[PDB]
Every structure is written in structure tokens, then in C-alpha cells.
Amino acid sequence: KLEAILSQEVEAEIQALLQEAEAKAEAVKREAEEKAKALLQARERALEAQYRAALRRAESAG
Amino acid sequence: VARRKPEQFIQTGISTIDVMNTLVRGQKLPIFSGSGLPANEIAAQIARQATVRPDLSGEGEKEEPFAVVFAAMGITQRELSYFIQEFERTGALSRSVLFLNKADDPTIERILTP
């Protein structure tokens, strides 16, 4: 019938839009994990540096 | 007669040298500097990033102690301290010999000291 056409113009948009917004809610969240990981990768190198420098200084000093 | 061609290169921490000229042991390489130009800045970079290759050349010389010698021939108030504080960056002040000549020091010792 004619009401069955109407349910199909909607039922198409409301999956196109909600599939799109579940891949932005994916995407932001993927970059959020890859940032936190990298802000701790730079933190890891820094600490190392400070320890290699530190020990050399105490060897020289002594 | 007592020398022979060297061939063991070092990391100066400046790309440009270690490609184009290749700074090896027993070789000079003046760094020409103008007047109204820095001289101090650039020098410091070569002192804290001077290091042999571990086997990147096919060998090292890290197996024998690497050390540095200094001797300044006329220096002011800033160049005095500027050098000393980058030698603590270097971590070398227990294995270096410094022959600092100032400008408040006699002018005759500017050619003796070398």
C-alpha cells in the first residue's frame, strides 16, 4: 500500500545517519587512545634520559 | 711519515658535516665565523654531540676512553660561564684539561697558550 512507501523513505536515512555517527564515535575514541599512548611514550623516554645523565654525573663527581 | 690516512668517522650531531666533508680523526676543519656573527652557540653543539660510531663505520673506538681538551684565547664575561655550563651538559669536567685565557689575563699569553 501507500503507507508502506512512507516507512521506506525514512527507514534508510535513519540507518545512513546512525551508521555515520557510530563511526565518528569510533574515530574520536581511536585517536583518544592513540594520543594517551603517545603522551606516555614521550614520558617513558624522558625518565630514561634523566637516569642515564644522572648516573654519569655521579660517577664524574665522585 | 709517521701518519697514514684515517677513516674512522664520528657523529658531530650535525648532519651536513658527516655527509659532505666527513669529519674523521687527525683532520682539521675550521669553522669560519664572521664578526657580528655567533661563534659560541655553534661551538657548543659540536662539544656535547661529539661521539664515535659504535660499529656504524664497521667499528668503534668507544672501547678506549674519548675525552676533550679545551683552551680559550680571549673570552669575556658571558663566554666564560657559557662554556663551563655546557661542559656539565657534556658531563665532562673530570676528564678534560682546560687552558682558559681571558682578556683580563695578559695579551702576551694569547699566543703562548696555544
PDB file of C-alpha atoms in Angstrom:
ATOM      1  CA  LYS A   1       0.000   0.000   0.000  1.00  0.00           C
ATOM      2  CA  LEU A   2       0.838   3.771   0.219  1.00  0.00           C
ATOM      3  CA  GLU A   3       1.923   3.854   3.897  1.00  0.00           C
ATOM      4  CA  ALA A   4       4.457   1.197   3.112  1.00  0.00           C
ATOM      5  CA  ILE A   5       6.219   3.625   0.730  1.00  0.00           C
ATOM      6  CA  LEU A   6       6.342   6.279   3.537  1.00  0.00           C
ATOM      7  CA  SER A   7       8.127   3.900   6.033  1.00  0.00           C
ATOM      8  CA  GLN A   8      10.814   3.181   3.473  1.00  0.00           C
ATOM      9  CA  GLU A   9      11.926   6.806   2.792  1.00  0.00           C
ATOM     10  CA  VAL A  10      12.608   7.223   6.498  1.00  0.00           C
ATOM     11  CA  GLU A  11      13.982   3.733   7.008  1.00  0.00           C
ATOM     12  CA  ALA A  12      17.142   4.359   5.070  1.00  0.00           C
ATOM     13  CA  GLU A  13      18.193   7.842   6.297  1.00  0.00           C
ATOM     14  CA  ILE A  14      17.869   6.644   9.933  1.00  0.00           C
ATOM     15  CA  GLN A  15      20.426   3.974   9.189  1.00  0.00           C
ATOM     16  CA  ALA A  16      22.701   6.110   6.985  1.00  0.00           C
ATOM     17  CA  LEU A  17      22.900   8.817   9.705  1.00  0.00           C
ATOM     18  CA  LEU A  18      23.244   6.365  12.641  1.00  0.00           C
ATOM     19  CA  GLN A  19      25.945   4.336  10.940  1.00  0.00           C
ATOM     20  CA  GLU A  20      27.816   7.593  10.219  1.00  0.00           C
ATOM     21  CA  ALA A  21      27.608   8.779  13.824  1.00  0.00           C
ATOM     22  CA  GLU A  22      28.743   5.362  15.204  1.00  0.00           C
ATOM     23  CA  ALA A  23      31.901   5.808  13.048  1.00  0.00           C
ATOM     24  CA  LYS A  24      32.692   9.281  14.476  1.00  0.00           C
ATOM     25  CA  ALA A  25      32.060   7.900  17.959  1.00  0.00           C
ATOM     26  CA  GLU A  26      34.596   5.184  16.884  1.00  0.00           C
ATOM     27  CA  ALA A  27      37.026   7.652  15.344  1.00  0.00           C
ATOM     28  CA  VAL A  28      37.346  10.156  18.143  1.00  0.00           C
ATOM     29  CA  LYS A  29      37.756   7.291  20.516  1.00  0.00           C
ATOM     30  CA  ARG A  30      40.555   5.625  18.357  1.00  0.00           C
ATOM     31  CA  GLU A  31      42.542   8.900  18.202  1.00  0.00           C
ATOM     32  CA  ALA A  32      41.951   9.369  22.012  1.00  0.00           C
ATOM     33  CA  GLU A  33      43.745   6.000  22.699  1.00  0.00           C
ATOM     34  CA  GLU A  34      46.500   6.639  20.209  1.00  0.00           C
ATOM     35  CA  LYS A  35      47.149  10.141  21.873  1.00  0.00           C
ATOM     36  CA  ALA A  36      47.286   8.961  25.569  1.00  0.00           C
ATOM     37  CA  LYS A  37      49.627   6.089  24.490  1.00  0.00           C
ATOM     38  CA  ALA A  38      51.940   8.700  22.724  1.00  0.00           C
ATOM     39  CA  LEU A  39      51.957  11.225  25.648  1.00  0.00           C
ATOM     40  CA  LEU A  40      53.258   8.350  27.697  1.00  0.00           C
ATOM     41  CA  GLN A  41      55.811   7.284  25.076  1.00  0.00           C
ATOM     42  CA  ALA A  42      57.472  10.686  25.381  1.00  0.00           C
ATOM     43  CA  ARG A  43      57.166  10.417  29.209  1.00  0.00           C
ATOM     44  CA  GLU A  44      58.993   6.953  29.014  1.00  0.00           C
ATOM     45  CA  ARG A  45      61.944   8.393  27.050  1.00  0.00           C
ATOM     46  CA  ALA A  46      62.283  11.396  29.305  1.00  0.00           C
ATOM     47  CA  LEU A  47      62.666   9.427  32.533  1.00  0.00           C
ATOM     48  CA  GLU A  48      65.341   7.199  30.930  1.00  0.00           C
ATOM     49  CA  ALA A  49      67.378  10.242  29.803  1.00  0.00           C
ATOM     50  CA  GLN A  50      67.255  11.600  33.357  1.00  0.00           C
ATOM     51  CA  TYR A  51      68.677   8.454  34.792  1.00  0.00           C
ATOM     52  CA  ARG A  52      71.477   7.902  32.156  1.00  0.00           C
ATOM     53  CA  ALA A  53      72.560  11.667  32.822  1.00  0.00           C
ATOM     54  CA  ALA A  54      72.124  11.352  36.487  1.00  0.00           C
ATOM     55  CA  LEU A  55      74.441   8.293  36.879  1.00  0.00           C
ATOM     56  CA  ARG A  56      77.148   9.740  34.652  1.00  0.00           C
ATOM     57  CA  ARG A  57      77.166  12.951  36.755  1.00  0.00           C
ATOM     58  CA  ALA A  58      77.535  10.943  39.983  1.00  0.00           C
ATOM     59  CA  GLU A  59      80.363   8.920  38.502  1.00  0.00           C
ATOM     60  CA  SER A  60      82.276  12.109  37.401  1.00  0.00           C
ATOM     61  CA  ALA A  61      81.543  13.870  40.710  1.00  0.00           C
ATOM     62  CA  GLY A  62      82.907  11.086  42.735  1.00  0.00           C
TER      63      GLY A  62
ATOM     64  CA  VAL B   1     105.850   9.562   7.529  1.00  0.00           C
ATOM     65  CA  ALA B   2     104.522   8.526  10.911  1.00  0.00           C
ATOM     66  CA  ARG B   3     100.890   9.314   9.758  1.00  0.00           C
ATOM     67  CA  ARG B   4      98.632   7.377   7.466  1.00  0.00           C
ATOM     68  CA  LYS B   5      95.056   8.014   6.040  1.00  0.00           C
ATOM     69  CA  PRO B   6      92.335   7.818   8.805  1.00  0.00           C
ATOM     70  CA  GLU B   7      88.992   6.557   8.004  1.00  0.00           C
ATOM     71  CA  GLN B   8      87.052   6.199  11.295  1.00  0.00           C
ATOM     72  CA  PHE B   9      84.266   8.828  11.263  1.00  0.00           C
ATOM     73  CA  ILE B  10      82.333  10.481  14.180  1.00  0.00           C
ATOM     74  CA  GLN B  11      78.932  11.828  14.860  1.00  0.00           C
ATOM     75  CA  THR B  12      79.107  15.638  15.317  1.00  0.00           C
ATOM     76  CA  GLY B  13      75.363  15.783  15.700  1.00  0.00           C
ATOM     77  CA  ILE B  14      75.196  17.981  12.620  1.00  0.00           C
ATOM     78  CA  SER B  15      74.056  16.064   9.579  1.00  0.00           C
ATOM     79  CA  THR B  16      75.627  18.393   6.896  1.00  0.00           C
ATOM     80  CA  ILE B  17      79.235  17.693   8.114  1.00  0.00           C
ATOM     81  CA  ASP B  18      79.014  13.887   8.462  1.00  0.00           C
ATOM     82  CA  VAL B  19      77.848  13.562   4.698  1.00  0.00           C
ATOM     83  CA  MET B  20      79.635  16.391   2.753  1.00  0.00           C
ATOM     84  CA  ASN B  21      83.104  16.709   4.393  1.00  0.00           C
ATOM     85  CA  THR B  22      83.065  13.760   6.833  1.00  0.00           C
ATOM     86  CA  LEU B  23      84.867  14.755   9.939  1.00  0.00           C
ATOM     87  CA  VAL B  24      87.415  11.941  10.740  1.00  0.00           C
ATOM     88  CA  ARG B  25      90.249  11.818  13.404  1.00  0.00           C
ATOM     89  CA  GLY B  26      93.561  13.592  12.741  1.00  0.00           C
ATOM     90  CA  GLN B  27      91.851  16.073  10.368  1.00  0.00           C
ATOM     91  CA  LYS B  28      91.155  19.793  10.720  1.00  0.00           C
ATOM     92  CA  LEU B  29      88.077  21.520   9.574  1.00  0.00           C
ATOM     93  CA  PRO B  30      87.991  25.230  10.633  1.00  0.00           C
ATOM     94  CA  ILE B  31      84.565  26.544  11.273  1.00  0.00           C
ATOM     95  CA  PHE B  32      84.770  30.049   9.601  1.00  0.00           C
ATOM     96  CA  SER B  33      82.769  32.633  11.603  1.00  0.00           C
ATOM     97  CA  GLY B  34      82.218  36.310  10.851  1.00  0.00           C
ATOM     98  CA  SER B  35      82.330  39.261  13.275  1.00  0.00           C
ATOM     99  CA  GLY B  36      78.770  40.249  14.333  1.00  0.00           C
ATOM    100  CA  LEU B  37      78.023  36.544  13.970  1.00  0.00           C
ATOM    101  CA  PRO B  38      77.801  33.943  16.907  1.00  0.00           C
ATOM    102  CA  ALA B  39      80.710  31.635  17.426  1.00  0.00           C
ATOM    103  CA  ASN B  40      79.837  30.293  20.745  1.00  0.00           C
ATOM    104  CA  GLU B  41      76.479  28.903  20.091  1.00  0.00           C
ATOM    105  CA  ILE B  42      77.515  26.687  17.229  1.00  0.00           C
ATOM    106  CA  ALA B  43      80.743  25.524  19.007  1.00  0.00           C
ATOM    107  CA  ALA B  44      78.761  24.088  21.959  1.00  0.00           C
ATOM    108  CA  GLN B  45      76.664  21.799  19.654  1.00  0.00           C
ATOM    109  CA  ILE B  46      79.924  20.074  18.447  1.00  0.00           C
ATOM    110  CA  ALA B  47      81.116  19.566  22.109  1.00  0.00           C
ATOM    111  CA  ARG B  48      78.069  17.731  23.567  1.00  0.00           C
ATOM    112  CA  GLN B  49      77.191  15.699  20.449  1.00  0.00           C
ATOM    113  CA  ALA B  50      80.862  14.565  19.607  1.00  0.00           C
ATOM    114  CA  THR B  51      80.762  10.750  19.600  1.00  0.00           C
ATOM    115  CA  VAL B  52      82.399   7.817  17.713  1.00  0.00           C
ATOM    116  CA  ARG B  53      80.287   5.330  15.802  1.00  0.00           C
ATOM    117  CA  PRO B  54      79.862   2.075  17.712  1.00  0.00           C
ATOM    118  CA  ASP B  55      80.110  -0.044  14.500  1.00  0.00           C
ATOM    119  CA  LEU B  56      78.157   2.160  12.122  1.00  0.00           C
ATOM    120  CA  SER B  57      81.517   2.646  10.269  1.00  0.00           C
ATOM    121  CA  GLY B  58      82.331  -1.026  10.858  1.00  0.00           C
ATOM    122  CA  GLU B  59      83.935  -0.328  14.272  1.00  0.00           C
ATOM    123  CA  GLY B  60      84.081   1.776  17.340  1.00  0.00           C
ATOM    124  CA  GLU B  61      86.719   3.446  19.483  1.00  0.00           C
ATOM    125  CA  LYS B  62      84.296   3.599  22.405  1.00  0.00           C
ATOM    126  CA  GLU B  63      86.396   0.663  23.764  1.00  0.00           C
ATOM    127  CA  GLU B  64      89.042   3.338  24.574  1.00  0.00           C
ATOM    128  CA  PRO B  65      88.110   6.472  26.607  1.00  0.00           C
ATOM    129  CA  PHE B  66      87.036   9.556  24.436  1.00  0.00           C
ATOM    130  CA  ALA B  67      87.883  12.889  26.107  1.00  0.00           C
ATOM    131  CA  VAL B  68      88.135  16.530  25.169  1.00  0.00           C
ATOM    132  CA  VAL B  69      90.622  19.352  25.690  1.00  0.00           C
ATOM    133  CA  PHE B  70      89.881  22.992  25.642  1.00  0.00           C
ATOM    134  CA  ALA B  71      91.822  26.223  25.609  1.00  0.00           C
ATOM    135  CA  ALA B  72      90.251  29.560  25.017  1.00  0.00           C
ATOM    136  CA  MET B  73      92.495  32.523  23.882  1.00  0.00           C
ATOM    137  CA  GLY B  74      90.446  35.537  24.846  1.00  0.00           C
ATOM    138  CA  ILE B  75      86.986  35.446  26.335  1.00  0.00           C
ATOM    139  CA  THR B  76      84.645  37.968  28.087  1.00  0.00           C
ATOM    140  CA  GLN B  77      82.133  37.587  30.992  1.00  0.00           C
ATOM    141  CA  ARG B  78      79.412  35.689  29.179  1.00  0.00           C
ATOM    142  CA  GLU B  79      81.787  33.272  27.193  1.00  0.00           C
ATOM    143  CA  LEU B  80      83.491  32.229  30.329  1.00  0.00           C
ATOM    144  CA  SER B  81      80.407  30.771  32.065  1.00  0.00           C
ATOM    145  CA  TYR B  82      78.630  29.793  28.859  1.00  0.00           C
ATOM    146  CA  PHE B  83      81.319  27.272  28.065  1.00  0.00           C
ATOM    147  CA  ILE B  84      81.571  25.762  31.643  1.00  0.00           C
ATOM    148  CA  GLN B  85      77.757  25.194  31.930  1.00  0.00           C
ATOM    149  CA  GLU B  86      77.706  23.184  28.625  1.00  0.00           C
ATOM    150  CA  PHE B  87      80.577  21.033  29.817  1.00  0.00           C
ATOM    151  CA  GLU B  88      78.286  19.983  32.752  1.00  0.00           C
ATOM    152  CA  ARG B  89      75.821  19.136  29.924  1.00  0.00           C
ATOM    153  CA  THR B  90      78.636  17.174  28.381  1.00  0.00           C
ATOM    154  CA  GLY B  91      79.285  15.515  31.736  1.00  0.00           C
ATOM    155  CA  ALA B  92      82.968  16.075  31.244  1.00  0.00           C
ATOM    156  CA  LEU B  93      84.789  18.146  33.840  1.00  0.00           C
ATOM    157  CA  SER B  94      86.510  15.121  35.451  1.00  0.00           C
ATOM    158  CA  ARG B  95      88.244  14.012  32.231  1.00  0.00           C
ATOM    159  CA  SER B  96      89.137  17.333  30.457  1.00  0.00           C
ATOM    160  CA  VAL B  97      92.077  19.752  30.568  1.00  0.00           C
ATOM    161  CA  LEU B  98      91.061  23.482  30.280  1.00  0.00           C
ATOM    162  CA  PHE B  99      93.606  26.168  29.363  1.00  0.00           C
ATOM    163  CA  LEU B 100      91.347  29.260  29.611  1.00  0.00           C
ATOM    164  CA  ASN B 101      92.929  32.568  28.644  1.00  0.00           C
ATOM    165  CA  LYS B 102      90.783  35.634  29.375  1.00  0.00           C
ATOM    166  CA  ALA B 103      91.099  39.201  28.160  1.00  0.00           C
ATOM    167  CA  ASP B 104      91.748  40.315  31.702  1.00  0.00           C
ATOM    168  CA  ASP B 105      94.662  37.859  31.604  1.00  0.00           C
ATOM    169  CA  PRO B 106      97.737  39.249  29.783  1.00  0.00           C
ATOM    170  CA  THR B 107      97.714  39.850  25.977  1.00  0.00           C
ATOM    171  CA  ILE B 108     101.017  38.089  25.528  1.00  0.00           C
ATOM    172  CA  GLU B 109      99.622  34.712  26.702  1.00  0.00           C
ATOM    173  CA  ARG B 110      97.155  34.744  23.789  1.00  0.00           C
ATOM    174  CA  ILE B 111      99.924  33.189  21.560  1.00  0.00           C
ATOM    175  CA  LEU B 112     101.779  31.308  24.356  1.00  0.00           C
ATOM    176  CA  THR B 113      98.816  29.331  25.418  1.00  0.00           C
ATOM    177  CA  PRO B 114      98.058  27.648  22.021  1.00  0.00           C
TER     178      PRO B 114
END
